[PDB]
Amino acid sequence: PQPSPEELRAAEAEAASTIQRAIATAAVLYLAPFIVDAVYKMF
Amino acid sequence: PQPSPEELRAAEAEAASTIQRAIATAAVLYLAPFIVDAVYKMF
Amino acid sequence: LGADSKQERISKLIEISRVVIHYGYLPMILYLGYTRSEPKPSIIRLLSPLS
Amino acid sequence: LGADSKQERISKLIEISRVVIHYGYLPMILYLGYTRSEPKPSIIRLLSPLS
Amino acid sequence: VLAYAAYFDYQRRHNAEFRRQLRRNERRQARAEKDLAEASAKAQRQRIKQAVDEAKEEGFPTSAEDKEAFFLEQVQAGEMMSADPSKHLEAALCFYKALKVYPTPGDLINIYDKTVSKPILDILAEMIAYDSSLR
Amino acid sequence: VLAYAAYFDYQRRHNAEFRRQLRRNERRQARAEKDLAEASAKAQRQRIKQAVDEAKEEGFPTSAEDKEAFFLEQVQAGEMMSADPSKHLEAALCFYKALKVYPTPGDLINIYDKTVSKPILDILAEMIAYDSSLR
Amino acid sequence: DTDSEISTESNFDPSEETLADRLHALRDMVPPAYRGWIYHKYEQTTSAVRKALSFAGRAAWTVSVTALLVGVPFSLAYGEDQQYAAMEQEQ
Amino acid sequence: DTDSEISTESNFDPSEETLADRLHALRDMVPPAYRGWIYHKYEQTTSAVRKALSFAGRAAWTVSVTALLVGVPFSLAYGEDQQYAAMEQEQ
Amino acid sequence: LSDLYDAFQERRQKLGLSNPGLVENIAKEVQRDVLTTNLMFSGLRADLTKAFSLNPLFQVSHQFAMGERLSPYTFAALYGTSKMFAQGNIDDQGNLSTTFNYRWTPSFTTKTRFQITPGATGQDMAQFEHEYSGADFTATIKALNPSFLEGGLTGIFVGQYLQSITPKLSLGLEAVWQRAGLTQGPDTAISYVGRYKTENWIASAQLQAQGALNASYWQRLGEKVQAGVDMTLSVNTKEGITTFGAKYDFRMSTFRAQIDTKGKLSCVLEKRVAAPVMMTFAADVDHFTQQAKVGVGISIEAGGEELQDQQPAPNIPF
Amino acid sequence: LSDLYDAFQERRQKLGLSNPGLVENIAKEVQRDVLTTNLMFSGLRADLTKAFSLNPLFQVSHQFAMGERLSPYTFAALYGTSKMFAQGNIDDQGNLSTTFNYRWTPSFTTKTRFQITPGATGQDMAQFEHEYSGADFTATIKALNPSFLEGGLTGIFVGQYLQSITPKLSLGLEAVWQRAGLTQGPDTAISYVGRYKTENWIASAQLQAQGALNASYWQRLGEKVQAGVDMTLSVNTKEGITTFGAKYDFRMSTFRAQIDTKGKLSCVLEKRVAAPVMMTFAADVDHFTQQAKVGVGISIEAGGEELQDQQPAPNIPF
Amino acid sequence: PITGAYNALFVSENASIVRSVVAFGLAVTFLASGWAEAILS
Amino acid sequence: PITGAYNALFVSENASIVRSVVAFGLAVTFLASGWAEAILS
Ligand SMILES: C[C@@H]1CC[C@@]2(OC1)O[C@H]1C[C@H]3[C@@H]4CC=C5C[C@@H](OCCC(CO)CO)CC[C@]5(C)[C@H]4CC[C@]3(C)[C@H]1[C@@H]2C
Ligand SMILES: C[C@@H]1CC[C@@]2(OC1)O[C@H]1C[C@H]3[C@@H]4CC=C5C[C@@H](OCCC(CO)CO)CC[C@]5(C)[C@H]4CC[C@]3(C)[C@H]1[C@@H]2C
Numbered sequence A, B: 001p002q003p004s005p006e007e008l009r010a011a012e013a014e015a016a017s018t019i020q021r022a023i024a025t026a027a028v029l030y031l032a033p034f035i036v037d038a039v040y041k042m043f
Numbered sequence C, D: 001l002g003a004d005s006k007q008e009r010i011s012k013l014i015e016i017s018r019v020v021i022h023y024g025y026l027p028m029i030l031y032l033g034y035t036r037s038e039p040k041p042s043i044i045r046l047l048s049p050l051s
Numbered sequence E, F: 001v002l003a004y005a006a007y008f009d010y011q012r013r014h015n016a017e018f019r020r021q022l023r024r025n026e027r028r029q030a031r032a033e034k035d036l037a038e039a040s041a042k043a044q045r046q047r048i049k050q051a052v053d054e055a056k057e058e059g060f061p062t063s064a065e066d067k068e069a070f071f072l073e074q075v076q077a078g079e080m081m082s083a084d085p086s087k088h089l090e091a092a093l094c095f096y097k098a099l100k101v102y103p104t105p106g107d108l109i110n111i112y113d114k115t116v117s118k119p120i121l122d123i124l125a126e127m128i129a130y131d132s133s134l135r
Numbered sequence G, H: 001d002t003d004s005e006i007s008t009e010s011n012f013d014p015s016e017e018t019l020a021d022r023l024h025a026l027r028d029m030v031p032p033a034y035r036g037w038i039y040h041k042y043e044q045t046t047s048a049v050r051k052a053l054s055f056a057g058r059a060a061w062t063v064s065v066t067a068l069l070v071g072v073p074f075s076l077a078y079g080e081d082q083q084y085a086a087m088e089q090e091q
Numbered sequence I, J: 001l002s003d004l005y006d007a008f009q010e011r012r013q014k015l016g017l018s019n020p021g022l023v024e025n026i027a028k029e030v031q032r033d034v035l036t037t038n039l040m041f042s043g044l045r046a047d048l049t050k051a052f053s054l055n056p057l058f059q060v061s062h063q064f065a066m067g068e069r070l071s072p073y074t075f076a077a078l079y080g081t082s083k084m085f086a087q088g089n090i091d092d093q094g095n096l097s098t099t100f101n102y103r104w105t106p107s108f109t110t111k112t113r114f115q116i117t118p119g120a121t122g123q124d125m126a127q128f129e130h131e132y133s134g135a136d137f138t139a140t141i142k143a144l145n146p147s148f149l150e151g152g153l154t155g156i157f158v159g160q161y162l163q164s165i166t167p168k169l170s171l172g173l174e175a176v177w178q179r180a181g182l183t184q185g186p187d188t189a190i191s192y193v194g195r196y197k198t199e200n201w202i203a204s205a206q207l208q209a210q211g212a213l214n215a216s217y218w219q220r221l222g223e224k225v226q227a228g229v230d231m232t233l234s235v236n237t238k239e240g241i242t243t244f245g246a247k248y249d250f251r252m253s254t255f256r257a258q259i260d261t262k263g264k265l266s267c268v269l270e271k272r273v274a275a276p277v278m279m280t281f282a283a284d285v286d287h288f289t290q291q292a293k294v295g296v297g298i299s300i301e302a303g304g305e306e307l308q309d310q311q312p313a314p315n316i317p318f
Numbered sequence K, L: 001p002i003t004g005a006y007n008a009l010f011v012s013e014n015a016s017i018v019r020s021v022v023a024f025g026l027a028v029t030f031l032a033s034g035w036a037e038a039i040l041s
């Protein structure tokens, strides 16, 4: 069936939040090698 | 439709007569080369 | 002309002959070859494709 | 948001752009090659498969 | 051309008689185009009517085996003709011949309505309307 | 063995009690074989009856689009099951489900009678006889 | 087709015409009978040319595939034969 | 199953038996319950063996086609490569 | 009396005629040696042949195939001798085709063929054939499924005759008799054939009384190239097809190509990629539908090494 | 501020990382260099390629084909330069596929693709792609049929990121955003990928949040042989397939073969029968159905003689 | 001219017979005239 | 033994997953163990 407008607004917010969490992970990846460097220097 | 018995007898006779005429031609073929030889000797 | 019982028996003969040829014809050819070939191949080699 | 007349005009632009690319894209590539190749091939040879 | 077009436009804009002469010719042509369309439809309608009449003269099989074979042949013929846009009339006749032989034409019509193209259905629909004997 | 067979044959031919003992055992076995056959048919009949009952619990679609999709799916399922001799019961159920959804079951039965194999038709025929609600 | 009916368009004006109307007037310049008959021939001419191009294209494909399908195996078979002739001649 | 019903076969004779009946009597020697149960296992055993032969045959075909389909092009490609290695080594 | 028979035979011998061969071969040079019809196939094919002897001939063959109407597997074995030849081939489905030819006399041959189909019913057939090969003629009679079980002669019967008229011209005759069921009348058909043969070219024709006509022409184009053309006409509707083709004999490969009036093009390339291996590539292009069928195959013979000393037995009745 | 940016960049440079390449290539060594999936075909195929220059690259190509989902004819032409690359190919039916990549910066690339379908309606598409290639990472964004005509963003959008963690380990991310129609809610999917790369072997994986998993392993078996194995799992039902294959690099031919858990076997043989001609034979055997698809093809390049002096332009953005 | 030839060559009940026969006529001439040996070899 | 393995290997909802995973396990070992280099080259 066709969705209601508030359900659409709920989906639109959820989807945006998912991609925002993805870009947050991407930023971690861009910063990840320096973290891995520390591990070799921790021992 | 299915054939009548006299029509079958007519077909059986016709078919036999055809093959008998064939064997008559075959006999001519077996005898044919001597006829062709005469033609070369007719001139 | 022909007796119905005779036709049944004759038809049975064809069926029996059919079964024998179906099963026995190929083994017969191999037997003729295997026993008459020059030289005689090994039983394993007799039906090996390329070994 | 967007005017219906504007959407009609914009959609028409896509249709026109679609037609141009359909007919003009391949001749454009040959023109770039034919005019910029080193050396310049013959017009007959320019599309000959193997001659 | 532009000088003539400007004079033509000026005359058309300011001279009502110039428009009237042109409009009369335009109106006359509009009439001819309508009359031409009507003549073509009536002639086409006659071919559709003729096709049903032609099928009546050829007759239909009466035996179940011949009816089934004829039905399948007409369906096969209809599908084969349906691929040719010049045979829409011929395709509808084959569907009509099969439909007339099928025991439940109403059920077969629903199949044709879904499997047969509308241009053939349009001819076939008129064939059905012309053959008031179709059950 | 031959000596025993000759004695067995001699006893069977000349001793009526020897035949009676054997015949009683033979008659007893004939009874058991009939009883075994009857039990299998009734159990099979229950599965056929069960299959129609199972279809009733699952229900059938009501909308035309769902009915058409379900009909095609059941026909497709029936044909797919018809290839497996172990699914004759399952194939008949699919043909039964489609037949129950088809608007003119009588016409579809004539199609099944020609397109479906008799072993499935035999089960399907009993399914039809069990489902007295089939039109 | 009555003079009184046509008389309804008694008045006209150059400024009253819309840009689309002035552009549409350009098509009105051509006689409708001639333009309709010319357009018909245009359709017939375009269809005939397209049929010709399809036939010419279909023909070139047929000859092209024929030469490849027959010439390719042949050129290799004939070519390979020539090598044996060359090697045998060196003996 | 009544002694009076079975008593109907009161009299029998060796000569009265037909050749077919005497031959059929041979099958009667085997107990029907056992022979019926043995025949059932015979059917199950013959079906299982035929399934095994079909599987073994289908397997041999699969391995045979696999070795040919992969080994044949490979043997030629590998073989042709070896010729170039031989000709190059002669330099 | 022998007096006339001897004089007749002597007068016959002085004409210098020769045996024209089987009727079915009057077009062999075209229908099999030039046209691709007998070699075309689709999909993959592989023949593993093991030869165990050459005199007597004895070989075992495994054919693997995956394509249109090709059986996944076929086992074949054959045995041959100067006086006899027996062959059998069986499909994975048990369809068994057999052949048995025996020479009762160097001029007389009996040919027996069988085709057995198991539980699934495909009609099984029996074909008995008798051939005579005189010094200047050939006679043949066939009996396919001959039966008298119904109290009357049934089955299919064929009579064939071919006569050499001159050292180059051959004329023949064909007669058919059929009766699928005693309840229906027998059907008979006659066909006339002829051939003119020379060293460089051969022309043949086969005219059915029904109206169908098959004619072919073959000509040698040098030591390595030969080509032929075949025309077939049918009047069952009126239909006719003409096929033109050529064959090339290179040292290590044979190339065949043909085209016909129906727009079909086909080629077959057989190449000896190795001493025991022969490759085959076949392609058929239908220009009216633009569809092509590709066939790739291989043949392997591995028994030659021991077999080198021997020599094939002569005149095996293949 | 640049003070930190410079220090950050310097600290970044000292790690010795390198560009890991496009996300779609983390399995290239397996999915294209070893497995046959990208080379399999059926029927006949013939490519007639004419090269007119190497710098700038310019070549015209004619493809003839007759087989399953193969267009009877396809004309293709392409032009390339160190800064740009334009390609177009058109089917006999007018279906036109195009590509246009331009280097705005050596580290930035724009990729445009079109697919036009004439009077018959097959959806026509437009794909815009932007790629960035840093010293140690790659970023990518795609927009397929992007439209705002309905007053809201529509079409398909893809974001891709791949980061080199160590000189051998690469980790990445994938994000999808979709909205086929404004009347329905947008759908988004994320996929995680990673790769560990060494000189002798490379292992990669692609895990969808939906549950599907694609993993592959590649290893070199000497100078002329390499093989790899690919596993794919789906949980849409639970399904999985594992493919094992190897590739041989002879002097004049390359042979590829693979087998998978579904019983399929396929092989591809490419052989340089001549300097301009390359043959291809492809066969796919489905052991569960015993059916085989055969493909035979040829490629011809005839422009080299004049072209010998020149040299291909470097880093053409293919 | 063509009307009297095209009808019997492309739009008649025997068009296939004539086309097959005509094709045969050319092939035989092409072979017998020696052109094939000068062309195919 | 086999009953606890065959069920999870040939007659389960995930039989295809296990079969694909197991096949992958062998292939990787076959490559990494060096046997492939000793066999395929
Ligand atoms: C188990 C089943 C039977 C066997 C089989 O699997 C299935 O096993 C494979 C082994 C293959 C052969 C191995 C090596 C060669 C030598 C090569 O090189 C010639 C070079 C030339 C130089 O002058 C002469 O020496 C020619 C081909 C040949 C014979 C192969 C043929 C195909 C064969 C027989 C395959 C066959 C299908
Ligand atoms: C059953 C049907 C009967 C017709 C037919 O089968 C079908 O039977 C053949 C009879 C043939 C002709 C017979 C003789 C000659 C003389 C010869 O002369 C060469 C020179 C030579 C003698 O002078 C000295 O070298 C040229 C050819 C020609 C005309 C034949 C043409 C083909 C014909 C018509 C054949 C045709 C196919």
Ligand SMILES: C[C@@H]1CC[C@@]2(OC1)O[C@H]1C[C@H]3[C@@H]4CC=C5C[C@@H](OCCC(CO)CO)CC[C@]5(C)[C@H]4CC[C@]3(C)[C@H]1[C@@H]2C
Binding pocket: J192, J193, J194, J195, J196, J203, J204, J205
């Ligand atoms: C997104 C998902 C994350 C996991 C994954 O992608 C998917 O990402 C990779 C991480 C890899 C491991 C990382 C490091 C090592 C150490 C190395 O040690 C060799 C000796 C060397 C260092 O001491 C000195 O020469 C052996 C291999 C191993 C264990 C890898 C195994 C494969 C793994 C698990 C790969 C796996 C496919």
Ligand SMILES: C[C@@H]1CC[C@@]2(OC1)O[C@H]1C[C@H]3[C@@H]4CC=C5C[C@@H](OCCC(CO)CO)CC[C@]5(C)[C@H]4CC[C@]3(C)[C@H]1[C@@H]2C
Binding pocket: K024, K025, K026, K028, K029, K030, K032, K033, K034
């Ligand atoms: C029944 C059908 C009717 C049509 C047809 O048969 C079939 O009728 C046949 C007549 C044939 C020609 C007869 C003679 C020659 C002369 C020869 O040249 C060397 C002659 C030599 C004399 O000394 C030096 O001049 C070359 C061949 C050629 C032209 C024949 C070609 C094929 C033709 C046209 C045949 C054609 C197909």
Ligand SMILES: C[C@@H]1CC[C@@]2(OC1)O[C@H]1C[C@H]3[C@@H]4CC=C5C[C@@H](OCCC(CO)CO)CC[C@]5(C)[C@H]4CC[C@]3(C)[C@H]1[C@@H]2C
Binding pocket: L024, L025, L026, L028, L029, L030, L032, L033, L034
């Ligand atoms: C996630 C899935 C679970 C199952 C699985 O991954 C996928 O888990 C992995 C463990 C791997 C083994 C690890 C180490 C070795 C030792 C090496 O020998 C040289 C060692 C050297 C030390 O100095 C000299 O001894 C040869 C290869 C081998 C046996 C691997 C084979 C593949 C295995 C079994 C993989 C298997 C497929």
